[PDB]
Structure 1
């Protein structure tokens, strides 16, 4: 098997002399064939903050990673890397990674404090932002890397386990693993897009930490996978939180298309920053369009049932409340775990979590109302248990009263009394 140089949201040349090296929420990096050399261009979306620049590549960089403080470049064959800080205050630096026979650099990543290099033999070389080496580690062959601050999300491949992932932190003291080569349930690729899968065998369109620090991956099945409870090894689950193919279908008014595609950039709380690609090819082109936003949706929608109700896609309030309930539940659980362990990063997480818990109960109360409407006392009671706020429990009682369900009211009041008794302890 042949390992290929990976970079987040990178595109292949195809029939052109240009492609994108890497791409995320910060900006995009492209490279153009200049006779015998290359012309690399580093661009940004926040034009105010950073200044777009370009330089001549005499090495043929095929690996790249972009963050808010700098850009990392890599040559998969010669093993030469270069880190270029965005500001001119900090100097560029260059190293050459030792490569054995047939060994290739497969993926690189960088944070403001760390520089990461992974190879096909499983060499994990790490540095600080200045190029000072920390320790050389031997792991499974690495196929994709991403990082955030001091933490690293790595994807490995072999002939045995197939695809696996590791989650680690490169602290000031030592390297610690949260997860070590656990199964990665991302669907592998199974033609006009053949150029892409020769360029990207795994079909990993991109991978990244969320804005709140949760590992995410976006495969050829165009489904965003988020890792839940990664801090508790026995509770770790991969969650499909967005079927982009479905959203496009819904945006297209229930029509099947073959010319609209999603290119993942990042995940900010509940929104997928991306590029909407219009054309036959699934990867973005020149010039790069303006980034779009796609709110995440739990894969609980059925096309047939959606079509029936329309007779952009309109969603029935009952069905939408169920998805909103699940979505809120997941996001709430995740954000709480974040605050319970790592604290705040942006300054609005507490406010977000509060509104998130609010949306949870509101959507849950809608389902509760429908259950009362259908005289389903049992299902309604189960929904009431899942309520968070005591004010929502109160609201549930009043809804039950309007529905004239006295048997339900007493049992919900039993819940309230029980929680009030826990308050006494």
Structure 2
């Protein structure tokens, strides 16, 4: 089994020289292979709110996480990371993560007050928004990370029972677990879109917290799974609150079209922010379509 570098709603290069590193309701980040290095572009959907920019990537970042305050970049093999605040008032900072032989960064995530790095050996490294290390934890091998404020939602892989998830709060006191490596009821991937499942074997298209604090995951079955009542152990269940396959079929009048695919961005209370993809590929290309909204 291979531990591929993961980012929310990221796309593979395919036959092209460009792809999206990550993608959500805030904006989209892309990288382009040029003559000798890479070129990273950070764009936003609310152009009135944030300044789009680009820079030369001498390192070749393949990991990325985006929020409303900054963008986090990661290089899976050298363990290099960089955080760029959206506002010029705040300084960028760079840091190298220690990696043992064969160890790769598999996922990164950030909030206004936290930076998270996960590895294939199960190292969980946390920082504040300025780079100061807060803790180093040993867990099961990490394959996917996401975060909201002080909460963290992590997906792990075990040789024995496969995919599991943990849910925790990185408060000021100490990291508290609400869920500790519990079963992840998500269907693994079962062709033109071959490059994608080579790029993301676990088929997790994206994952995120809802606007009201609930962990969401979006797999290859194209169903938005919501974890409700995670504060209470005796009643925490995963809800399939959206089968995007059904909603597409309804929008098509009742005709099964294999042209349209949903690309998850966020969950904002009542709607699923997404990208409706038209084409042979199930992942969006260039240019990026306008963000759509789907009722729950």
TM-score if structure 1 supplies the norm length?
Answer: 0.68
Residues 204-254 of structure 1 show CA distances to partners (whole Å, capped at 9, x for unaligned) of: 000000011100000000000000110001211000000001110111011
Partner of 2:3, secondary structure, is: coil
Task: Say if 1:249 and 1:422 are closer, same or farther in 2 by CA, change over 3 A.
Answer: closer
Question: In 2, distance between residues paired with 1:234 and 1:31?
Answer: 44
Question: In 1, distance between residues paired with 2:15 and 2:215?
Answer: 34
**Cα offset, 1:423, TM superposition:** 37
Question: In 2, distance between residues paired with 1:273 and 1:267?
Answer: 6
**Cα offset, 1:268, TM superposition:** 0.5
Partner of 1:76, secondary structure, is: coil
Question: In 2, distance between residues paired with 1:260 and 1:36?
Answer: 36
Which position in structure 1 is the counterpart of 2:295?
423
**Cα offset, 1:128, TM superposition:** 0.2
Question: In 2, distance between residues paired with 1:98 and 1:234?
Answer: 39
Question: In 1, distance between residues paired with 2:190 and 2:181?
Answer: 23
Question: In 2, distance between residues paired with 1:51 and 1:134?
Answer: 30
Residues 385-404 of structure 1 show CA distances to partners (whole Å, capped at 9, x for unaligned) of: xxxxxxxxxxxxxxxxxxxx
Higher RCO structure, 1 or 2 (CA under 8 Å, sep 6+): 2
**Cα offset, 1:159, TM superposition:** 1.3
**Cα offset, 1:422, TM superposition:** 41
CA contact (8 A) 2:272 2:294 kept: no
Task: Say if 1:253 and 1:129 are closer, same or farther in 2 by CA, change over 3 A.
Answer: same
Question: In 2, distance between residues paired with 1:95 and 1:35?
Answer: 26
Task: Say if 1:171 and 1:37 are closer, same or farther in 2 by CA, change over 3 A.
Answer: same
> What residue ranges of structure 1 are gaps of 5+ in the alignment?
291-420
Question: In 2, distance between residues paired with 1:181 and 1:35?
Answer: 44
CA contact (8 A) 2:263 2:284 kept: yes
Partner of 1:171, secondary structure, is: coil
**Cα offset, 1:34, TM superposition:** 1.1
Question: In 1, distance between residues paired with 2:120 and 2:64?
Answer: 16
CA contact (8 A) 2:273 2:294 kept: no
> Rg bigger for which structure?
1
Residues 18-62 of structure 1 show CA distances to partners (whole Å, capped at 9, x for unaligned) of: 000000000000000011200000000000110100000000000
**Cα offset, 1:161, TM superposition:** 1.5
Q: Would you tell me which structure has more strand in proportion to its own residues?
A: 2
TM-score if structure 2 supplies the norm length?
Answer: 0.97
Partner of 1:83, secondary structure, is: strand
**Cα offset, 1:123, TM superposition:** 0.3
Question: In 2, distance between residues paired with 1:36 and 1:280?
Answer: 30
Residues 311-346 of structure 1 show CA distances to partners (whole Å, capped at 9, x for unaligned) of: xxxxxxxxxxxxxxxxxxxxxxxxxxxxxxxxxxxx
**Cα offset, 1:173, TM superposition:** 1.3
Q: Would you tell me which structure has more helix in proportion to its own residues?
A: 1
Task: Say if 1:25 and 1:422 are closer, same or farther in 2 by CA, change over 3 A.
Answer: closer
Task: Say if 1:252 and 1:121 are closer, same or farther in 2 by CA, change over 3 A.
Answer: same
Question: In 2, distance between residues paired with 1:276 and 1:241?
Answer: 18
Q: Is 1:18 the counterpart of 2:26 in the alignment? A: no
Which position in structure 2 is the counterpart of 1:161?
161
Task: Say if 1:171 and 1:423 are closer, same or farther in 2 by CA, change over 3 A.
Answer: closer
CA contact (8 A) 2:270 2:295 kept: no
Aligned residues: 294
Alpha-carbon RMSD across the aligned residues, in angstroms, is 4.6
Q: Deviation above 4 Å: which 4+ runs of structure 1? A: 421-424
Task: Say if 1:246 and 1:423 are closer, same or farther in 2 by CA, change over 3 A.
Answer: closer
Partner of 1:160, secondary structure, is: coil
> What residue ranges of structure 2 are gaps of 5+ in the alignment?
none
Question: In 2, distance between residues paired with 1:130 and 1:42?
Answer: 20
Question: In 2, distance between residues paired with 1:35 and 1:422?
Answer: 40
Which position in structure 1 is the counterpart of 2:55?
55
